[PDB]
Write a protein that binds this ligand. Structure first.
Ligand SMILES: NC(=O)c1ccc[n+]([C@@H]2O[C@H](COP(=O)([O-])OP(=O)(O)OC[C@H]3O[C@@H](n4cnc5c(N)ncnc54)[C@H](OP(=O)(O)O)[C@@H]3O)[C@@H](O)[C@H]2O)c1
Ligand SMILES: NC(=O)c1ccc[n+]([C@@H]2O[C@H](COP(=O)([O-])OP(=O)(O)OC[C@H]3O[C@@H](n4cnc5c(N)ncnc54)[C@H](OP(=O)(O)O)[C@@H]3O)[C@@H](O)[C@H]2O)c1
Ligand SMILES: C[C@](O)(c1ccc(C(=O)N(C2CC2)[C@H]2CC[C@](CCC(N)=O)(c3ccccc3)CC2)cc1)C(F)(F)F
Ligand SMILES: C[C@](O)(c1ccc(C(=O)N(C2CC2)[C@H]2CC[C@](CCC(N)=O)(c3ccccc3)CC2)cc1)C(F)(F)F
Lengths: 272, 272
């Protein structure tokens, strides 16, 4: 259930926001847009130094306030405590942007069970832990959770098997709890972001000299994420391909969820 | 992946070497039985030792070429790995790996139980990956098949089954991706993903007792349909008691989209 109007930057002014994986790439881009909009930001990642750079530019850009707390989202204790500390720094929370992933490479799957588990722990499970911890704050602000996923969390590509497992898991979990928030009247929005290849240094280094589809700009990607999030959209799509509309516009899933969503809808085609 | 264009006939399994997990009860047990009637060699597994022994007996009675059981929990990755080697030895190889077991769950709103989420991912998903890695060399030898049992709720969202849907979405992501890897690497092992609606197994029927519109499909037919899809090397089996649902759950447009992505570079240019 989105917000009616069109996006205005004014919407984030004074809002209290967490961005994870925000020392590099898209997370850093998002932090910068949030700063320019005059939000309070807490950013996180493992690296002390790179987070400081981002904090400094955020303040320069006009952020109501800016802070960083460092640590690995492999540590579910850290994840849980991080949201607590970040909520103290800002006096509440309006938007939780879940963006970090564990380092991965483009490669055939062979037998790296430990990579599959780590991808699942860092890319999926840590997001559930951060959500549980943030939810009381979000409940009292009528806030928003933004979950960064990928085209590879909607369709199958080779070379990203463990990664794709974890992005699909995000769709299943968060789309399910969105249905639960709706039956339990929890006014917290959940936005799933489905991104094409984006020109972050990590990705551009991986695809160097291999044949692949155009990368889209990270800066606009980051604004489009914040906009869909602020507007409380269920999904945000950002990529460069003409083909992607085949995914975006397929209404089958929405039709099925609708058919099964009430006893009255199931009564159309199913005996009581 | 190429489906065999021959019609299904019971003889396709006679003397074939087949694993079935989750076979002490429900669909799994039904599958073991069907495979017995076809004269396959079966190794069955689950945690319930005395129920499995019973299952092995009725199997032999129905005409299984050989029938053994090894008991253990798929919470334990070591055991998953162990189970496959030992089951191979018992049969002289492996033609089909049928992955069917899930960890217990109930129909409830998710609150804060990260541990049940993790355990779901470990058992319903990570174990399936361990079993596959352990099975692959033998399935290469035989040009065999991997069958992965999943659910409507691994394709669309439902409330009350969040951790469970995460694990089932994860299976789609992982196995659909390694299927693309197997086509480009020319590995001749098929991957069939089965998408089931509500089935009339005792676990499910208990959990939905007294709930309205709970139309279940018969587990006996369900089990046959999975075996056929596996045997015919189909990419997906769709099985539900509603005709509408069975039609609407097809997603050929994702498969076309996947092809387009695999044959595009730069601004949607064709590689060939
Ligand atoms: N770039 C693409 O082509 C693309 C496409 C589709 C979707 N996405 C999605 O967009 C999001 C951001 O991607 P990106 O390419 O911008 O990534 P990135 O630039 O490589 O940055 C990843 C961020 O996560 C942090 N990180 C890595 N491991 C961590 C850990 N264990 N604990 C805490 N933080 C950790 C990194 O900082 P530290 O190393 O210091 O911890 C960094 O801040 C991801 O969710 C990704 O799936 C990207
Ligand atoms: N029933 C439905 O309405 C429905 C719908 C869609 C999809 N499915 C799928 O169909 C498959 C089977 O479902 P079902 O209804 O037949 O299930 P079930 O009757 O409840 O039995 C599940 C099987 O998994 C085994 N199992 C449980 N925990 C285990 C563990 N830790 N390690 C190893 N095995 C374990 C159980 O045996 P033990 O207790 O002896 O270990 C049992 O044999 C599942 O993958 C499920 O997701 C079912
Ligand atoms: C972590 C990482 O930065 C990463 C970046 C993005 C993604 C991802 O989400 N995408 C999905 C959104 C499209 C991948 C898909 C595979 C890809 C596109 C293939 C094509 N058809 O265009 C490809 C695979 C193999 C070779 C070359 C390209 C590259 C992009 C995953 C990991 C890495 F790993 F370091 F790069
Ligand atoms: C383990 C278990 O036996 C189980 C059985 C099946 C499934 C499953 O895969 N299905 C998907 C295939 C359809 C569920 C989805 C939710 C469901 C359908 C909702 C509706 N509108 O039809 C429902 C939710 C809430 C209340 C009542 C029903 C029941 C069926 C998951 C777990 C349990 F948990 F013990 F039951």
């Amino acid at each position: 259930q989105p917000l009616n109007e069109e996006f205005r930057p004014e919407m984030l002014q004074g809002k209290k926001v967490i961005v994870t994986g925000a020392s590099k790439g898209i997370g850093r881009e998002m932090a910068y847009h949030l700063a320019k909009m005059g939000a309070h930001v807490v950013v996180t990642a493992r690296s002390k130094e790179t987070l400081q750079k981002v904090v400094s530019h955020c303040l320069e850009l006009g952020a109501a306030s800016a802070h960083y707390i460092a640590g690995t989202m492999e540590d579910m204790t850290f994840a849980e405590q991080f949201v607590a500390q970040a909520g103290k720094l800002m006096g509440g929370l309006d938007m939780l942007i879940l963006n970090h992933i564990t380092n991965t490479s483009l490669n055939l799957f062979h037998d790296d069970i430990h990579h599959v588990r780590k991808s699942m722990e860092v890319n999926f499970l840590s997001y559930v832990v951060l959500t549980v911890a943030a939810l009381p704050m979000l409940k009292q602000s009528n806030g928003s959770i933004v979950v960064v996923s990928s085209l590879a969390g909607k369709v199958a590509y080779p070379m990203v098997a463990a990664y794709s497992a974890s992005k699909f898991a995000l769709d299943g979990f968060f789309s399910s709890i969105r249905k639960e928030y709706s039956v339990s009247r929890v006014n917290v929005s959940i936005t799933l972001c489905v991104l094409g290849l984006i020109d972050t240094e990590t990705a551009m280094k991986a695809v160097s000299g291999i044949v692949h589809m155009q990368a889209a700009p990270k800066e606009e990607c980051a604004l489009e994420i914040i906009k869909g999030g602020a507007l409380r959209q269920e999904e945000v799509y950002y990529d460069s391909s003409l083909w992607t509309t085949l995914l975006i516009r397929n209404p089958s899933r929405k039709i099925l969820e609708f058919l099964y969503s009430t006893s009255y809808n199931m009564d159309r085609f199913i005996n009581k």
